[PDB]
Write a structure and sequence with these properties.
This is part of a larger assembly, with 1 copy of chain A, 1 copy of chain B, 2 copies of chain C and 1 copy of chain E.
Chain A (H helix, E strand, L loop, with lengths): L21 E3 L8 E7 L17 E5 L12 E7 L4 E2 L5 E2 L5 E4 L16 H6 L1 H5 L6
Antiparallel strand pairs in A: 1-2, 2-3, 3-4, 4-7, 5-6
Chain B lengths: L18 E3 L7 E3 L2 H9 L11 H6 L10
Chain E lengths: L46 E13 L11 E10 L3 E7 L14 E2 L37 H13 L5 E6 L13 E5 L5 H12 L2 E2 L11 E6 L5 E2 L1 H4 L35 E2 L4 E7 L45 E5 L9 E3 L32 H11 L10
Antiparallel strand pairs in E: 1-2, 1-13, 2-12, 3-4, 3-5, 3-7, 5-6, 8-11, 9-10
Helix pairs in contact in E: 1-2
The chains are: A mainly beta, B alpha+beta, C little secondary structure, E alpha+beta.
Chain E binds 3 RNA strands through strand 1, strand 2, strand 6, strand 8 and strand 9.
PDB class: translation
Keywords: translation, ribosomopathy, EFL1, GTPASE, ribosome biogenesis
Entry title: Mechanism of eIF6 release from the nascent 60S ribosomal subunit
Amino acid sequence: MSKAQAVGSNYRVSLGLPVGAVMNSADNSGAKNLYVIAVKGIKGRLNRLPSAGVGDMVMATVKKGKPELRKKVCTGLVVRQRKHWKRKDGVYIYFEDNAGVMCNPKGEVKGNILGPVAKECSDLWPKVATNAGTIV
Amino acid sequence: MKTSLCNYSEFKIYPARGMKFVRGDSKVFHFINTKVESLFFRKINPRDIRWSMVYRRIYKNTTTDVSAK
Amino acid sequence: GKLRYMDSREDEQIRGITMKSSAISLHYATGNEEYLINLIDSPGHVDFSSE
Amino acid sequence: APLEPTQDGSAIETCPKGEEPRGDEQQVESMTPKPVLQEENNQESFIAFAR
Amino acid sequence: MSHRKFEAPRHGNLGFRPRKRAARHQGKVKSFPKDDRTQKVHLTAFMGYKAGMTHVVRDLEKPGSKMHKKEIVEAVTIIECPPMYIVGLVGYVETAQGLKTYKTVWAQHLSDNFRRRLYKNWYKSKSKKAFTKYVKQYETEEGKKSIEASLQAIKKRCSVVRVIAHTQVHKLKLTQKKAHVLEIQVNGGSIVEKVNFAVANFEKTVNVTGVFAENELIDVIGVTKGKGFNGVIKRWGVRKLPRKTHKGLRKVACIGAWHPSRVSTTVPRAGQLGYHHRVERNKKIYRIGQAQPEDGKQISTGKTEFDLTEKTINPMGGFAHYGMVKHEFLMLKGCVAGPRKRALTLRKSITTQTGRAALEKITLKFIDTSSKFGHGLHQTAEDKTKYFGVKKSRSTKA
RNA sequence: GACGGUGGCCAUGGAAGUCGGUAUCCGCUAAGGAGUGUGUAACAACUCACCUGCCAAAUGGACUAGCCCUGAAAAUGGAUGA
RNA sequence: CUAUGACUCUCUUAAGGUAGCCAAAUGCCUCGUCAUCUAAUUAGUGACGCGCAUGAAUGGAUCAAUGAGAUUCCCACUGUC
RNA sequence: CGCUCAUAGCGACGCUGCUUUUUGAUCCUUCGAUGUCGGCUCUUCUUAUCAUUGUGAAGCAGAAUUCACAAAGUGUUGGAUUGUUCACCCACUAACAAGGAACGUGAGCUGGGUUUAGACCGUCGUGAGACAGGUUAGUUUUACCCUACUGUUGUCAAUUGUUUGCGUAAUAGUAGCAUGAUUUAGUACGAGAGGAACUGUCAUGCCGGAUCACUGGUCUGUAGGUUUAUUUGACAAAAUAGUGACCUGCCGCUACCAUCCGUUGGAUAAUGGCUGAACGCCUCUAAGUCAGAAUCCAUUCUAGAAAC
């Protein structure tokens, strides 16, 4: 799932961390944390984490949030990777700290996206682009 | 590309090389060096190195002008 | 145009149901009269019924 | 409204109030026109279709 | 036991399995295309010299993309491309065993290549008077008769011929004490035509402008960096000593099983790191430059915007160990075999190809100048720094 | 060429040789089962059984056992000893 | 027998597991059942407990303080990966 | 059985087999000792092909499956739980297929179990003690030899000139594999609901070869600064602190923690035909031959023969 990239996949993979990394929910829904289970499309090989997306969809969970949203897996969307990258451009976007949002399995983000969102992510997921006034 | 201030330095971006940073507030911060970044994260005008010429002036042996203060 | 629920399709034309319950306010102040048309889209049902 | 969609661009510089930039994309399909007059205040369901 | 995974590729390609120290410190050739086009002006192969890399912005031409034209930095390899002088011809002969060097036919033109194939003859490892002309250099006036005699022979004998070419590098700063000879199999046109062309060449000394285009897919051949006696953890893509509690430095762990009861050839093992040939294919090239010396020195990129304010392309200073440019150049799209005293024997691709972004003609914008601690962006940053002060920074380090 | 009593009787608006079922008889002819299938809502049409024209002398089934093949896949490369 | 077996009757080898406690370091069947803890738990912990084969100085039950003690869970300075 | 219909797909009752990846039967070899189990590591191998490609079927309209063949070229995952294979859920995925190789791999590992001494509990035993009963703690030694292998010198003394260039290429190895979005197209297909392909286009996963323009990483560059303690009477400049610590930090080496690069011809397989007999017809076949796989072999690529 979902899947819709992009055109392209907005080029190479970069992560803040793979499996077992907290990033904030950045969402009006009362998920307060997002912890990764795994990432979609990772086919992977012998001993290698299923590694965080640059703006791609993930199997996640609400570890600390609303108890209703707590437990039960959730497809999400990575929004900003603390750990850095170069783009086809020659810039190195880098962030304060990791972040994403909990989302629908057609990609759609629920409420409104908080804070700054890398443009690649927006490009990937049109709903994301729609539901924010910050796309930097 | 195009020339731009690094937002914590007089040393401007050579339209080519360096880094970028967004932060929680959502802001442009282009950078060139890691030292600059460090300085930003501390919040201080440069005071553990000679490389930035702010320091050679206030130490003397380069910029022999204002000398004593 | 095409607001207040109305999804146009070529599939339907080819042959397709895609039923829906909607209504557009389509009044006309043409000349000296009124014309209460209103785009009624009754979904109905494919088999014989009360529905 | 949240400020800075673009970075070093002419969106925040202009800061449109429905002038030259937003006039475009209102002829092929009106982007965000409020088609059915959406719910400003909370739900109190008394809806019906009927004749 | 099953395995039990799946993947275990032989960490590493088996395709380079001898992994020796490759002999020829120029990209050794053993491969060219074939043709009979009236255009026989193509020779197949040049040889330049790497003297570092820089980077460049160029708006790219590949519609269908997320953006059809958009600024992007690409890295870029630059190589001093001096003159290829051609001291002789070598014919050949078609046969069962392969081909053969019956014997060469050298004209005259230059004799600097000679005192490189030398200073090694007789007792005490070496001497400096010739004991041998016994596989070597002929005369001049009483040389051309031989050529005339044998030209006709090679005209008739349909086996292909290559030119005994060589670059000039004592004209660079490097002062190479090794002989830098290279074959270039002439292609296109008749055998006779080819030999005539070769003959004509002896009267002249070609450069790369005639061989390749500004937009032209090369297959670089070089010698990679020879990184030394080195370990399996580092020689292949093998995951290491599983633990800290483990008892090895330099290991695989299993090396082939009781299985066929001797070790297998193909098993990850430490030796010395690839100093091989290899052939990086389809380097598109962005520019041939004009030669620096005797004007062209202050001209590597022309006009302001799209070529920008004038400059030399080169990376500044004499370098603590390394080379600085002084001749015409090739802007190969990123990376080549080895470091910066290393011969990139070039050849046009075997299967020259249309595709898409193999041929797409291409334009540039800003271009770098290297090292950030000590210098900045060439002439502009030179000026600003100077203005700021001459006690602080100017940007010239010998 | 491959007809008639005839849409035989049943079931069945209808299923007429042939959804399906039963009895399955005779006339005329060299020749034609109340019919092998295809097909038809079903009839028909075609095809078969069945008969003749031409070509012109061999043909058809059913088994039997000799060699060959199928069956007949497993792990370092590979053994009629080569 | 609505029944966990209070209670009666009998038999051996006298008595016949009381209070407690438990799939415990004691439970084979056994990954017991229910519950929680987890994205997922043969792990832990609460409960249940006709307990293969628990149990009262063979000492039973609990528990502050302590422990290079055994188990788990969370925060814990992320080259174990 | 499967509306109909034995064999599309299954297939009762019954028979013939293979297999040595279960375990038993066995005791031929080893008790003057093959280091027992598992997991990490890693190659190679077999096919009984999970995906892939090319195909043939279907109860195959489409998507989606199901069955068959050629085919081992390439792929075949991250966890939770358990000593653990076996097992048992979650999670992605093209697929998460089976196996072998002294039940591959202890002078490669840890030792989690099992297998000693100490102990605990239960049960059994008059007791010493027993328990495929649990529980807890319990030294993984030696390669400097021979070979095999990795890389490297040396030799090529009949590789023939006291010797040295530039070449050839036999032989060996060989590499790229795969996905997604988009176009096609909401078109074909389909009552509908749903819903494709050949080609093109842009990217990704893994893998393989390089590199360091950029960025990130590091520091004996002890290159500069900041600071502690100490010592050199102070200032200063230095030392000791076995690199004093800290912040920067070059060259350098390096990170799908960055970048660039990985082709095209014939030969076939299955299979689909063509002409076409044996067998007046008829038939992809017997003679003969067309197309045609990730295949085969070359091309390209590594090494370069007591080979020229």
